[PDB]
Structure 1
Amino acid sequence: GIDYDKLIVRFGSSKIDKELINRIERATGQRPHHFLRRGIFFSHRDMNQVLDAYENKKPFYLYTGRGPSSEAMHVGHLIPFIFTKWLQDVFNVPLVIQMTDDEKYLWKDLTLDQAYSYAVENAKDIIACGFDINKTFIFSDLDYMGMSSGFYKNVVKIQKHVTFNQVKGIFGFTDSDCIGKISFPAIQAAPSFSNSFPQIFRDRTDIQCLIPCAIDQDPYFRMTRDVAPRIGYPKPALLHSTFFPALQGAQTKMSASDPNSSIFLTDTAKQIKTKVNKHAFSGGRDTIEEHRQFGGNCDVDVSFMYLTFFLEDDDKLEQIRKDYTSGAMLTGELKKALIEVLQPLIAEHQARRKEVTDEIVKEFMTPRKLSFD
């Protein structure tokens, strides 16, 4: 697959080691999430500082986001949200979720209306993940921008402190780009500063922020961590995750356009099964005889990587890794297992989502004081 240890060293982040994991445990009195245990969330930035504060009764809040590329979301999209929902429960902190409808409107051929609608439609599945209506604010850039005292003020502060060359260097823009993309990064940085949410943090400017996100989002926050000092704020802490594997392989890329690219949150019990069997890449030997002697390759097998994300029972996963690695299990049974797991899983989601009424999305997306004052 891909070498994440090099990414870490490359970018400058830090590896999450057992020490850290154990701290999280001692600090939360709850067994750390399997993403932490199984290396899905492998890198971090300043997580110890976060823990130190937390353990010393100093408040911190969660910040994560979603780009509403489309109405169709897929299993891969849920990882950061799933983990964030867990972090919220376990630490009992408020959460802020950014729907970058304005970003997609900029990067894709979408109309302001479409973008927004996707931001709202997506809010449903994000909500379906179980976030506490009392301590989480899901917001649309297009909306919130125009109904906030602090948000825009921080963008302007952040923009006055980031040159085109910087973003050119970081994001690789070009003189040919729209001034809208050139300064969009400021918008994604802004929610890293508590006072961007006056109605929930009280013009407070030193509240620690922890940003769980996929490893590829880091550049935005590297730029953010960079400006913060320069503007009198504290830099956001980070917990990075690995990329979710496409059905065709860890290497290949997945889009909301290729439906056979991944399992979508709307797929049916039957579609789930079909996708795995007819598209999930394998690490299993060609002939079944070959497999029995050599055993599968757990490292490149998409189906197994999947279980790694959704088979919660730590022991059962092992039984599979073992019997699969040795050859005792044919990729056929493996896949069969992944389905037996995914089906009830997506079904579950689809139900929780249906319970999300319009008035619930409304509340979630309404800026207001949150439980933990």
Structure 2
Amino acid sequence: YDKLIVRFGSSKIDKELINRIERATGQRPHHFLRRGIFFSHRDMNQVLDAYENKKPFYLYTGRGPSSEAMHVGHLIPFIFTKWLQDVFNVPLVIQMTDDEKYLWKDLTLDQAYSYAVENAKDIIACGFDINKTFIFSDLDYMGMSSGFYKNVVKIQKHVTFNQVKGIFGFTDSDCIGKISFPAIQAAPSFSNSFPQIFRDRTDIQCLIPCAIDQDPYFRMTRDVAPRIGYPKPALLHSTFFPALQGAPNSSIFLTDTAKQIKTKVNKHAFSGGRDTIEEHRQFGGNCDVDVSFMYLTFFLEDDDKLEQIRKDYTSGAMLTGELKKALIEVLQPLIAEHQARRKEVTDEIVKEFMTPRKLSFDFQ
């Protein structure tokens, strides 16, 4: 990961920049920062500069509404974005790319759109404030903005096929909606794409939380920005979420019960311990390629108890199955609590989050 930074030319967060946040925030850096889940960035300093100089900034993230079974991995950006929203108290804009799924998959426009509404339930279950978050459907919001399509057009002019052909790999057997889709993903990065929220303001920086594997796709947007008179969108990159069986039982869905969660991490997670304990008691603990532990890295909020689990699993004291039932006690209460929060999401709360509204934000 330290070599993917140099590869994409991004800036690495320290344990010193993390402090800069704490000074304006007034909290304790989220464990993603503390642990390095979210390690890289691009222009966080620029966003920070305006936060103290008493100027707003906003967040943006999206979601590809392809059915659901949003697994626990998919929670990583949202958990972090939610945090960002609360410590800075700024607006967030969440995009549901229904057109995209329609273009790429065997769905009807309605089918893609219903998935967008449903996924929006799961997202709201994460707890986003309703007074500073706007979840929008591409298909819906294009028809309801006096600023969105215009920005999409500006981008479409300043980007050629050859450009989108290298970055995304589009060939020419593809449909045109695809070739031009990258402009729809980019448009949300610029404030005046949301008139009911921001107005015709253009000086509001945009912070985009996402992976590190994504930087090459967001550079297109960052490169077009100067060219159209708009500031670049800042970035905060994260690491990947270990695929369960190894880096259908392949992932752990938020719709999974409690026993399924139990039987998955027990029968399908990956082990680093010599596990087939010839005599794992002073060996075993490979906390780099052991999924169960990697997960605790994301979901167990206590550093002290985590380090204890690492010293102990690596040393050989803690066997496998012991570490596993430790994770289960973190997931089961994470997932089940998610499902409950999502039960309380009425058809009217969804419609609200998805309605072009004025928001309550920190101009500061």
Normalising by structure 2, report the TM-score: 0.97
Q: Which segment is superposed worse, 275-284 or 169-178? A: 169-178
In 2, the alpha carbon distance for the partners of 1:215 and 1:188 equals 17
In 2, the alpha carbon distance for the partners of 1:12 and 1:96 equals 27
Match of 1:278 in 2: 267
In 1, the alpha carbon distance for the partners of 2:309 and 2:111 equals 43
1:106 Cα deviation after fit: 1.3
Match of 1:341 in 2: 330
What secondary structure sits across from 2:16 in the alignment? helix
Query: Deviation digits for residues 42-71 of structure 1, max 9, x if unmatched?
Result: 110101111111111111011111111112
1:24 Cα deviation after fit: 1.0
In 1, the alpha carbon distance for the partners of 2:107 and 2:304 equals 46
1:340 Cα deviation after fit: 1.1
In 2, the alpha carbon distance for the partners of 1:114 and 1:71 equals 12
Kept in 1: contact 2:275–2:319 (CA 8 A): no
In 2, the alpha carbon distance for the partners of 1:116 and 1:325 equals 47
Kept in 2: contact 1:94–1:370 (CA 8 A): yes
1:290 Cα deviation after fit: 3.1
1:159 Cα deviation after fit: 0.5
1:146 Cα deviation after fit: 1.0
In 2, the alpha carbon distance for the partners of 1:112 and 1:321 equals 48
Normalising by structure 1, report the TM-score: 0.95
What secondary structure sits across from 1:52 in the alignment? helix
What secondary structure sits across from 2:237 in the alignment? strand
Kept in 2: contact 1:63–1:191 (CA 8 A): yes
Q: Following TM superposition, where does structure 1 have runs of at least 4 consecutive aligned residues deviating by more than 3 angstroms?
A: none
What secondary structure sits across from 1:247 in the alignment? coil
Query: Deviation digits for residues 182-217 of structure 1, max 9, x if unmatched?
Result: 111100000000000011101111111100112233
Kept in 1: contact 2:63–2:94 (CA 8 A): yes
Kept in 2: contact 1:189–1:220 (CA 8 A): no
| 5+ long unaligned stretches in structure 2 | none
In 2, the alpha carbon distance for the partners of 1:286 and 1:201 equals 55
- Pick from 200, 205, 217 the counterpart of residue 203 of structure 1: 200
What secondary structure sits across from 1:333 in the alignment? coil
Match of 1:143 in 2: 140
In 2, the alpha carbon distance for the partners of 1:167 and 1:359 equals 39
In 2, the alpha carbon distance for the partners of 1:132 and 1:352 equals 13
In 2, the alpha carbon distance for the partners of 1:9 and 1:178 equals 35
Kept in 1: contact 2:191–2:201 (CA 8 A): yes
Kept in 1: contact 2:285–2:315 (CA 8 A): yes
1:295 Cα deviation after fit: 2.9
In 1, the alpha carbon distance for the partners of 2:73 and 2:326 equals 19
Kept in 2: contact 1:247–1:280 (CA 8 A): yes
Identity %: 100
The answer to whether 1:367 aligns with 2:356 is yes
In 1, the alpha carbon distance for the partners of 2:21 and 2:211 equals 19
| 5+ long unaligned stretches in structure 1 | 250-258
Kept in 1: contact 2:272–2:289 (CA 8 A): yes
In 2, the alpha carbon distance for the partners of 1:362 and 1:71 equals 19
Query: Deviation digits for residues 325-361 of structure 1, max 9, x if unmatched?
Result: 1110011101111111111111100100101111000
In 2, the alpha carbon distance for the partners of 1:114 and 1:6 equals 41
1:289 Cα deviation after fit: 4.2
In 2, the alpha carbon distance for the partners of 1:172 and 1:306 equals 32
In 2, the alpha carbon distance for the partners of 1:283 and 1:221 equals 35
Kept in 2: contact 1:171–1:219 (CA 8 A): no
Query: Deviation digits for residues 274-315 of structure 1, max 9, x if unmatched?
Result: 000110011110432431121310000011000111100111
1:108 Cα deviation after fit: 1.9
In 2, the alpha carbon distance for the partners of 1:70 and 1:168 equals 27
Query: Deviation digits for residues 212-253 of structure 1, max 9, x if unmatched?
Result: 11223323310000000000000000011111111112xxxx
In 1, the alpha carbon distance for the partners of 2:216 and 2:192 equals 22
Kept in 2: contact 1:30–1:90 (CA 8 A): yes
- Number of residue pairs matched? 361
In 2, the alpha carbon distance for the partners of 1:316 and 1:166 equals 48
- How big is the alpha-carbon RMSD for the aligned residues of Structure 1 and Structure 2? 1.1
Kept in 1: contact 2:284–2:314 (CA 8 A): yes
Match of 1:325 in 2: 314
Kept in 2: contact 1:62–1:93 (CA 8 A): yes
Q: Which segment is superposed worse, 194-203 or 169-178? A: 169-178
In 1, the alpha carbon distance for the partners of 2:89 and 2:207 equals 13
The answer to whether 1:105 aligns with 2:75 is no
What secondary structure sits across from 1:212 in the alignment? strand
Kept in 1: contact 2:273–2:283 (CA 8 A): no
